[PDB]
Write a protein that binds this DNA or RNA. Structure first.
Ligand SMILES: [Zn+2]
Ligand SMILES: [Zn+2]
Ligand SMILES: [Zn+2]
Length: 85
DNA sequence: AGCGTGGGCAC
DNA sequence: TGTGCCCACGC
């Protein structure tokens, strides 16, 4: 990991500089992506997309066992295991 | 549960 | 780099 975060209080190191560039947003407080519905700002475009589903009710991920739908794949993943014994 | 949000990284 | 997934933790 050649790329160290230059912020004094931070000890994170990255394999790729582009990842350090994304990381630095934490320290600069930069949130370039805004939700046009509630005007909230987010650090990443991926997180803005899933956030928008909280407004639209879009839930693309259905449980294979019971059909319950979720906005995110990881939510469905956390859910499916409840069907275990 | 609902969902913010960082880290890894494919493309 | 931008875009956007998986994974994982947190409240
Ligand atoms: Zn840092
Ligand atoms: Zn919003
Ligand atoms: Zn289910």
């Amino acid at each position: 990991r050649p790329y160290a975060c230059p912020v004094e209080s931070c000890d994170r190191r990255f394999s790729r500089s582009a990842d350090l560039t994304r990381h630095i947003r934490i320290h600069t407080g930069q949130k370039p992506f805004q939700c046009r519905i509630c005007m909230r700002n987010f650090s990443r475009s991926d997180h803005l997309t899933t956030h928008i589903r909280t407004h639209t009710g879009e839930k693309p991920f259905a449980c294979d066992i019971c059909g319950r739908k979720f906005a995110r794949s990881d939510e469905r993943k956390r859910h499916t295991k409840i069907h275990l014994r």
